[PDB]
Amino acid sequence: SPTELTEMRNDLFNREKSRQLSLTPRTEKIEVKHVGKTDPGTVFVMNKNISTPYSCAMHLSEWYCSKSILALVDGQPWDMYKPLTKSCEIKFLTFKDPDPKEVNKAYWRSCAMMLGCVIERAFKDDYVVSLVRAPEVPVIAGAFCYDVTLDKRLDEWMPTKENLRSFTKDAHALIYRDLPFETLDVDARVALEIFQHNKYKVDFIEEKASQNPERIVKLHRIGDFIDVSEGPLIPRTSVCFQYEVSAVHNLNPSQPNLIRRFQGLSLPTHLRAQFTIWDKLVERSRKMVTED
Amino acid sequence: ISRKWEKKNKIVYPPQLPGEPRRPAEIYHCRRQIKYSKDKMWYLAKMIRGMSIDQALAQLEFNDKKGAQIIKEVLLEAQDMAVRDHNVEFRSNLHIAESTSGRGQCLKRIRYHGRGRFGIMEKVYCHYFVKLVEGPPPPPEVPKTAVDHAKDYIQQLRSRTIIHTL
Amino acid sequence: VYRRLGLGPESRIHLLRNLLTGLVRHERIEATWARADEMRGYAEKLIDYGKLGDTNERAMRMADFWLTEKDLIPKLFKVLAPRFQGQNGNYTRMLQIPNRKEQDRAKMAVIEYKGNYLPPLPLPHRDSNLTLLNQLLLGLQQDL
Amino acid sequence: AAPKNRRTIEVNRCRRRNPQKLIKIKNNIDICPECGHLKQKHVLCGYCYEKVRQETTKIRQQIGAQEGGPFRAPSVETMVLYTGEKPSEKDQGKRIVERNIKRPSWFT
């Protein structure tokens, strides 16, 4: 049963948190200086691997928390809820920054991860659904793409307008739930055990472990659902305001399994869109998206 | 004159036991003498009730009434002591639990008139009372759905008891 | 189509006359929003009179009456008029300023003469095309 | 004409606590990135404007001293120069205002 996999998957996620917490003895104070343009030069003494950038935002004002989606730690993008590691220089990133390219990637990746969660639970337990990977496509493409391999039983089934709406309802429920994006750095050995069943995920885990000298891999968890991430993700699911599953395109060479690439569009609350604009964007997001 | 609002800030709780949740901070601040009407000040107090510290400050900054500026100054003083003396870690983690205005001692004068009449002149003063609870403002009330309303009516009907019988 | 200001219609002209003279001397004046809008139309029309030419007798009469200080008359024909010869309009820029804290809370706005040597006002800037929403629209533009 | 009877506090309380008579909240409040202070969407920031406006007075004070007399408005264009900046050929035939301060970053 799928619940069994989530239960054991959730536990290993919890055990890793305990090991990291046990790894750090006592509370270590790290001096972090605010390099952000606003309120520059403020220095916070923080507990190592215990506090997060959100705590610093709480320290200053609520405006920081609402408008801060990411943090620049020593010039590196850090999640708002990622525990701090050392004394550093911290700056807050907003949706309206001059260069939202780093922010765009995190929003792009987070949307793909959320879509993957919908697919696995959307289908009945009778059918077998295996997620292959989340292809990285530019924002210019007009839609975020997620690839999934279905069971032979679903070879002849194509989503209808109502079925696509059902996926958005699941996505909308997740946004309504407002589940924070948990972040863990896990070794390949543990990650392989967590996702041993899905061979496609296994190779993706191997690639990330291969690139870096260690076996540490980036894992993100939304509630029970867990997935690997190419980079930082959105702090919470409530950020998205508009969500739509534009269309699904079936890859022709899909004999061993039916591989479908799902097209979707989402917009954050900070960036609302007019009714006509969204309709055209959704229409432009129903076209097959190639990777370039 | 009574100054029991300040005494509420001097209350010291017993040391908390290990099996007890971390007590949320409560701060009582007031300005005893303001040359302003309590009734006019009450309108400002009523609107800000239950709002966050930051949200209230933003509204006050763009408020046209003189009392609003005084309220913001009072709010800032309470926040400063809260961190300095009430061990508040986060400045933003504050909300307006209570806000009200009270009467203050006035001054009496005779109001002359150009036509030989006279009147009773009063210089009004008022007190302003606010209690701040550490943490975000509580979530707003959600209106009851039709399902909720119907269930109560049915429950009331079942709860009905026979009257004046064996 | 005309606001009621001052103690009478002639006072409005005198009040408008004083405001116009002050703007020319300094090129940037702050006043109530309602009054600033009323004087904006006159300022633009005056520049047209300046463009007409110094030798124009009507322009000289108009310039003399509206500008109490006569040193400004050479400036209009030799500074203001030459500067805007290329432009066909929109000589004056009016922007909203936070209301006065003078216990009356009147609506405040700043009216300035364009092309001036004064420090640039903090004008609003539209969102950059690098924003996520703008980038998506750019993609639609490229496809079309 | 006086009321036939005193109006009850309960009746009075309802009138003054009616939502129509209560103070309304504003949702158009915005933040100023430049000064880090609050602003309205249709109202420019004032903390930065104070620098520009007060800077203008300093420039105006220099201009007033340079003219030295009433009704002395030049018939030629005027330009402002700060320390470290030297007049160019294009600046020829233009009134020049000299400021001891260095060229401000915001001013271009």
């Binding site: 055209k280 | 949200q55 933003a58 | 533009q141 | 949702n27």
Partner: peptide, 30 residues
């Protein structure tokens, strides 16, 4: 602040994108 804000269609539309939007609306109407 987690509070409602006022927005309009032209709030976040750039000058280049704004011109494109006007052309698109005319095309849709036609």
């Amino acid at each position: 602040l987690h509070s409602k804000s006022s927005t309009w269609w032209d709030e976040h539309l750039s000058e280049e994108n704004l011109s494109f939007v006007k052309q698109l609306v005319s095309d849709e109407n036609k």
